[PDB]
Assembly symmetry: C2
Homo-oligomer: 307 residues x 2
């Protein structure tokens, strides 16, 4: 059996799998108060992509399609295409187009467009509100609020590039986005389907280990914390390697290569998430060259050294 | 010696190493008329990063720092920090900060900022003109044109997220960007140093093979072609594997997994670029599931089968 491995990359060398930004830090905290069911950054250790997860770090929270103006507004409806501009297949066994945002919030970035006939181009700031009833990416349709009332043309390739998140400063601060609330990918037309499962640690004394970034904020007082369950590079790696899983739990050690010392150990579950033995909120203190190293497959009874 | 490999990824599954967008296609053409000296997407087969190359594609053409308004304008100077908000170190023997744009052009995106004290945020469309006199990233400062003259605060973390490119003026359509012209990283009076080498075919009948994307256009009639010498995923892979180069030339075959048949072969040079045996400009026609496979190290005298 091909030996399982994780990448030799530091945290700061890696990328969030839920928004196209670098990782910053490792965080652990209790998660009983919410449902942890992200759909990006979901992959088994033997390389099966789950949810809306795809390989490209730059395609996370991007959309592509054609747009139609909503008369009397600055809003546009986008009829989605696939990430390579092929027709979007709404019958694929996924919750939504690959890379669709997996949280309720207002995501700001730019819409850009090229006129096929002559190579003329145009671009405008735009925001997608993933909690609104017009956010129906599984159906192939979403809406953007933009800074134009007439510039985008119909029947022309149009891309949304995400930048960051927005909040309404008149509501309680940091009340949005809600990173652990999934959109309704078909709006009010249907329930979510083909979801990667919710994750919840149940081994005594364990919490999830989160790979954390701070999303750019574009307006108001947003909650900019964004926690993913796997770095994007781990998704990419497992997809490549497809190493057989011996058991349901891979034991990783986080090591300082300068000293050889183990800082902590953690469980990488076959279904694609990480737990540590800790209780409470904690920003992990790690050396700048530290990285994760797979050491062995362990059984259901294995108890981690306390963090 | 660890066996050398390239990733099992299709072209469309991979990412441009010179701008944070997917690859679309393969292109070969004669390159005698310009200097091919990109600084991003530069890496040896045994994993030594070159030029301004760093590992995650989402950091390419991003900038971070604090900003100051230029009175009487809508322009801001950005005092650059490192990607993790440490001080930027201009004394490193690299051409410019890692991920700095390596073409002359006007790159549009958004500047975003968070006020540390209260978490208030703001974001504005912004353009950096990498050919202008203020573009001195090696020295630690650049200028942006924005749509505000008063909104950004001093002394606060500010990020530029790139989206695409712009063209305007009385010059010919597609006269900018100029993807094979490096910026003057230290200014218009300055000289670029510590560059990754210029590359050229050195065997009769050979041309470079380019990994091509189309950059989003944000205004006007820009030249949106962007050719890199290595997919970002190959940079990431070689850095991981660090497999010793047994010769100066790795022979790759491009394979159709549906049939197992080799479509063409190419040379992956140890110093990090690819050639094919072909004369003239050609958009390669490939099956969408096709991928590159390392077959053997060859000597300097190997003659490729015509593409």
């Amino acid at each position: 059996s091909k030996p399982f491995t994780v990448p030799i990359l530091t945290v700061e060398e890696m990328t969030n799998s839920r928004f196209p930004i670098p990782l910053e830090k490792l965080f652990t905290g209790p998660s009983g108060a919410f449902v942890v069911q992200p759909q990006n950054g979901r992959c088994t250790t033997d390389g099966v992509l789950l949810g809306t997860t795809q390989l490209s770090p730059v395609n996370i929270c991007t959309f592509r399609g054609d747009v139609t103006h909503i008369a009397g507004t600055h809003n546009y409806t986008m009829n989605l295409a696939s990430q390579n501009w092929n027709n979007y297949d709404p019958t694929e066994e996924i919750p939504a187009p690959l890379g669709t945002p997996d949280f309720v919030g207002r995501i700001q970035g730019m819409l850009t467009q090229t006129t096929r006939g002559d190579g003329s181009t145009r671009g405008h700031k735009a925001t997608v509100s993933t909690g609104d009833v017009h956010f129906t990416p599984k159906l192939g349709s979403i809406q953007f609020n933009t800074d134009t009332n007439n510039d985008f043309e119909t029947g022309q390739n149009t891309k949304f590039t995400p930048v960051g998140v927005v909040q309404d400063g008149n509501g309680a601060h940091q009340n949005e986005p809600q990173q652990w609330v999934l959109p309704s990918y078909s709006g009010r037309t249907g329930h979510n389907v083909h979801l990667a499962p919710a994750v919840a640690p149940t081994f005594p004394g364990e919490q999830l280990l989160f790979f954390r970034s701070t999303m750019p904020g574009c307006s108001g007082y947003p909650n900019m914390n964004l926690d993913c369950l796997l770095p994007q590079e781990w998704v990419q790696h497992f997809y490549q390697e497809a190493a057989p899983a011996q058991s349901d739990v891979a034991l990783l050690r986080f090591v300082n290569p300068d000293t050889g010392r183990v800082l902590f150990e953690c469980k990488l579950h076959k279904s694609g998430y990480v737990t540590v033995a800790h209780t409470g909120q904690h920003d992990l203190v790690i050396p700048p060259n530290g990285y994760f190293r797979f050491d062995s497959w362990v059984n259901q009874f294995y108890t981690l050294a306390p963090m």
